[PDB]
Amino acid sequence: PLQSVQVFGRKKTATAVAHCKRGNGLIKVNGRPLEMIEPRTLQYKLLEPVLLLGKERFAGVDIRVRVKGGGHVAQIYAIRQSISKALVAYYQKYVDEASKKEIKDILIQYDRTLLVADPRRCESKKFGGPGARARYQKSYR
Amino acid sequence: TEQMTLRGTLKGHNGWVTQIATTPQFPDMILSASRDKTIIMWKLTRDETNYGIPQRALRGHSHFVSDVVISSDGQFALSGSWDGTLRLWDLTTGTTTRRFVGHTKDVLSVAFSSDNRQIVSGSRDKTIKLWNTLGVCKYTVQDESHSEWVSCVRFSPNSSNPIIVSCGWDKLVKVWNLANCKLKTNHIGHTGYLNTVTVSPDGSLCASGGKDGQAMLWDLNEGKHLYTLDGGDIINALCFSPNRYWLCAATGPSIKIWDLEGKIIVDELKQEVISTSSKAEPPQCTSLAWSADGQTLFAGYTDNLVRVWQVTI
Amino acid sequence: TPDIKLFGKWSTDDVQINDISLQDYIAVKEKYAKYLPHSAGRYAAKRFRKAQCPIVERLTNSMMMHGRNNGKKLMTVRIVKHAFEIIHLLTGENPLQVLVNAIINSGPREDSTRIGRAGTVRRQAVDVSPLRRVNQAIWLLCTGAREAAFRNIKTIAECLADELINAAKGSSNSYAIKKKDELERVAKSNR
Amino acid sequence: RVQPIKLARVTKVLGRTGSQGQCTQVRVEFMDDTSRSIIRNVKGPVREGDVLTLLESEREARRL
Amino acid sequence: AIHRIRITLTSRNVKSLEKVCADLIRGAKEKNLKVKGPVRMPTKTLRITTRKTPCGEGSKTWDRFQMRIHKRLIDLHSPSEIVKQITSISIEPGVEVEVTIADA
RNA sequence: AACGAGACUCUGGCAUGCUAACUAGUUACGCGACCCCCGAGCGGUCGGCGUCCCCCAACUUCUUAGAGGGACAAGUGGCGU
């Protein structure tokens, strides 16, 4: 059948919807290669799952991602989290349980929220000070 | 005499195994439901590396999956879940054929007929209901019904007999007749509320149970109280056997397998000790089901395991 | 092991800890290797949770102070890639072994505290946690390079890499090993 | 003092002391004989099963 | 004739709004006009943040007030007569309604 | 027995379940058009890159807002009369 399963990633408002479709190679993000994406000092980070798992889980898929939201940093964690999760879901659904179970164990060993979403988001400013917890100076006499 | 050896144990769930049922088309598979919102279709081996591995896990329900049952074809599967809805699976990869919308509250029990066109359901809506296999309501039963939740319903052999069993928490067993939908009878005889009921494959018996403490037997052919046995403090599952005339009773710390010809206990299954304080050594057994061979039976427990046993002669 | 991660150039094996009093508070090789020292991290919400994140990550965190370098953790990783590079060329050792030695040689073993008696200052000498030694040792050597590059032609990278050589050796020509012995010199006195 | 540096490990933690709770009393086994044991005052936040590095064992403590 | 007619509803009360939407979807479905369900639009926030003290003195405090309006719209395509029939019936609470001549 | 406390209301973190979407999207081709061999190949054909083209297409993961579900010291081990 038409093999397509979709996932998303999060990190503090930054969605990255990564569809995993059958194929081979040719992983992209935003219609660009992920061999350069432009801070490229955190370049080793989005490459990390691919490098660690080897090329033999990526031996039959094209994964492509669209993004929006967040800053430069938070986008990198979102796209990484999505492609990792994409791979897992694909094997659970069209291959078998024991296929994805190995791969799940590998990622969660060096967990860096590779299968879960960071809960933390910004807290509101309340008056009487800048920020969400700081207070203006208070002078006596 | 015949006795039981501990065969092995399966692992795959993160929650309590609620029910198990068995494909007679393939004794190679076996199916399970659980309180971590998945039904696991297994791939069994008789090996020592494992006794089986989960093949797939069908997902969609937003709450626990209480009970599960096979189709006559064995290529479909049907479910009852604590989300108040049912799903009708196409037992291959997933891909729901139909989802059945009705019932205000949970779907506790569910069953699939021999004719494959009638599907019943027990619900905390206080309704027995009949279901087309197009997923629409052939009939709904809400008059002359239980005033308490309907615990478990069953299809009975339709050799010439149009009867379906119903038991509720109102301390009654109601028998309903197909396409008239009247009370055939009401049976009284359970101090506690009734959990379950099941009919013999031959079709002459109804092994019923509850929190009565006693396991009372009723007659499928006109409704008579055949006899009673002291045992089964809390009764959660019952299952007749095809290769013997036994009845296998699910109590919490133990399973009591009874020969009825004459009435005697064959064995009591006990699990090996584990040192606990104050006391949490038993896990509750909640379900059990025979294989087609009738040599091996499987059990669902609340320690997230499906324990296997085997009869030895 | 057959998928062992470097730093993109450095082994995390062949890294010794020369104390039994500071091993398992150094995190560098149990499975704590990573290609970068950037993570979301959990460094809080439980007391024993700081010691479970890498030493290299801790280093990047602790050198971003003085009110204008906060929120510029990405610039900080630039400084770390040059630091290790210079350390490896300069002496020949794997530059992680340098850092581990530098931490072990700089940690103070006794420190003083205050006690109020008779309305006059009295001091008492006390010992220190292993977790305290690590926290102190990371702070001290970083203070040297931060100070040095504050009006010099020399860049922060050069200063920091120099300071880890003299710390990793017993040379006592550094901002760290100076101040280490100063504290102990007090602790002897009011012992 | 100028005697070889000692190493001794926690057996039990007692409670926090100091004038702001800044110090922590702890009982320690000498880690070269367990029949020898001294109580110490330690600055840092100690836990259980940790090893310390004492520069003497002439001193014996019980509070500050 | 059969005109694509869009019935916009708008209110400040989500309960009072929603049941009146259900009524207008009912009256349409009753006559099988092939109506489209509610398309719930983003709820908008009116904010007013002002001093609690008249004539400044004491600690500086403010107070967030908010009103939340709600918009949602049902698309019909049917004769304009029967529309104005079904529109005017079964409305009791303070809820506004706006009928549109035609839509693309 | 009552008030204050908590309870409550609002807000945030969890749903591939439910409800339904040309003033929200996606996917799928149909594509025709542009583009480069850019990839297998040769420039053809097949694929890639986005836009117009898209539908009386398919869908609602992403966006939206309603009803519900979920968390209880519940489970396990210590400790406490």
UniProtKB/Swiss-Prot annotation, chain A:
Gene3D superfamilies: 3.30.230.10. Transmembrane segments: none annotated. The keyword Nucleus applies. Pfam families: Ribosomal_S9. It comes from the Eukaryota. Signal peptide: none annotated. The modification N6-acetyllysine is found at residue 55. The keyword Zinc does not apply. Keywords: Acetylation, Cytoplasm, Nucleus, Phosphoprotein, Ribonucleoprotein, Ribosomal protein. Component of the small ribosomal subunit. Part of the small subunit (SSU) processome, composed of more than 70 proteins and the RNA chaperone small nucleolar RNA (snoRNA) U3. Belongs to the universal ribosomal protein uS9 family. This is Small ribosomal subunit protein uS9. It comes from Oryctolagus cuniculus.
From Swiss-Prot, chain B:
The modification Phosphothreonine is found at residues 5, 9, 95, 276. This is Small ribosomal subunit protein RACK1. It is found in: Cell membrane; Cytoplasm; Cytoplasm, Perinuclear region; Nucleus. The modification Phosphotyrosine is found at residues 51, 227. Keywords: Acetylation, Apoptosis, Biological rhythms, Cell cycle, Cell membrane, Cell projection, Cytoplasm, Developmental protein, Gastrulation, Growth regulation, Host-virus interaction, Membrane, Nucleus, Phosphoprotein, Repeat, Ribonucleoprotein, Ribosomal protein, Translation regulation, WD repeat. GO terms for molecular function: ribosome binding; translation regulator activity. Coiled coil: none annotated. The gene is RACK1. GO terms for cellular component: dendrite; nucleus; perikaryon; perinuclear region of cytoplasm; phagocytic cup; ribonucleoprotein complex; ribosome. Phosphorylated on Tyr-227 and/or Tyr-245 by SRC. This is required for binding to SRC. The modification Phosphoserine is found at residues 275, 277-278. SUPFAM superfamilies: WD40 repeat-like. The modification N6-acetyllysine is found at residues 129, 182. It is a peripheral membrane protein. It comes from Oryctolagus cuniculus (Rabbit). GO terms for biological process: apoptotic process; gastrulation; rhythmic process.
From Swiss-Prot, chain C:
Pfam families: Ribosomal_S7 (PF00177). The modification N6-acetyllysine is found at residue 34. It is found in: Cytoplasm; Nucleus, Nucleolus. The keyword Acetylation applies. InterPro entries: Ribosomal_uS7, Ribosomal_uS7_CS, Ribosomal_uS7_dom, Ribosomal_uS7_dom_sf, Ribosomal_uS7_euk/arc. It comes from the Eukaryota. The modification Phosphoserine is found at residue 129. CDD domains: uS7_Eukaryote. GO terms for biological process: translation. Keywords: Acetylation, Cytoplasm, Isopeptide bond, Nucleus, Phosphoprotein, Ribonucleoprotein, Ribosomal protein, Ubl conjugation. PROSITE patterns: RIBOSOMAL_S7. There is a cross-link at residue 34 (Glycyl lysine isopeptide (Lys-Gly) (interchain with G-Cter in SUMO2)). The modification Phosphothreonine is found at residue 1. Its main location: cytoplasm. One of its GO terms (cellular component) is nucleolus. GO terms for molecular function: RNA binding; structural constituent of ribosome. Belongs to the universal ribosomal protein uS7 family. Component of the small ribosomal subunit. Part of the small subunit (SSU) processome, composed of more than 70 proteins and the RNA chaperone small nucleolar RNA (snoRNA) U3. Component of the small ribosomal subunit. The ribosome is a large ribonucleoprotein complex responsible for the synthesis of proteins in the cell. Part of the small subunit (SSU) processome, first precursor of the small eukaryotic ribosomal subunit. During the assembly of the SSU processome in the nucleolus, many ribosome biogenesis factors, an RNA chaperone and ribosomal proteins associate with the nascent pre-rRNA and work in concert to generate RNA folding, modifications, rearrangements and cleavage as well as targeted degradation of pre-ribosomal RNA by the RNA exosome. This is Small ribosomal subunit protein uS7. The gene is RPS5.
Swiss-Prot record, chain D:
The modification Phosphoserine is found at residue 37. CDD domains: S1_S28E. One of its GO terms (cellular component) is rough endoplasmic reticulum. GO terms for biological process: cytoplasmic translation; maturation of SSU-rRNA; ribosomal small subunit assembly. This is Small ribosomal subunit protein eS28. Component of the small ribosomal subunit. The ribosome is a large ribonucleoprotein complex responsible for the synthesis of proteins in the cell. Part of the small subunit (SSU) processome, first precursor of the small eukaryotic ribosomal subunit. During the assembly of the SSU processome in the nucleolus, many ribosome biogenesis factors, an RNA chaperone and ribosomal proteins associate with the nascent pre-rRNA and work in concert to generate RNA folding, modifications, rearrangements and cleavage as well as targeted degradation of pre-ribosomal RNA by the RNA exosome. Keywords: Acetylation, Cytoplasm, Endoplasmic reticulum, Nucleus, Phosphoprotein, Ribonucleoprotein, Ribosomal protein. PANTHER family: 40S RIBOSOMAL PROTEIN S28 (PTHR10769), SMALL RIBOSOMAL SUBUNIT PROTEIN ES28 (PTHR10769:SF3). It is found in: Cytoplasm, Cytosol; Cytoplasm; Rough endoplasmic reticulum; Nucleus, Nucleolus. GO terms for molecular function: structural constituent of ribosome. Component of the 40S small ribosomal subunit. Part of the small subunit (SSU) processome, composed of more than 70 proteins and the RNA chaperone small nucleolar RNA (snoRNA) U3. Pfam families: Ribosomal_S28e (PF01200).
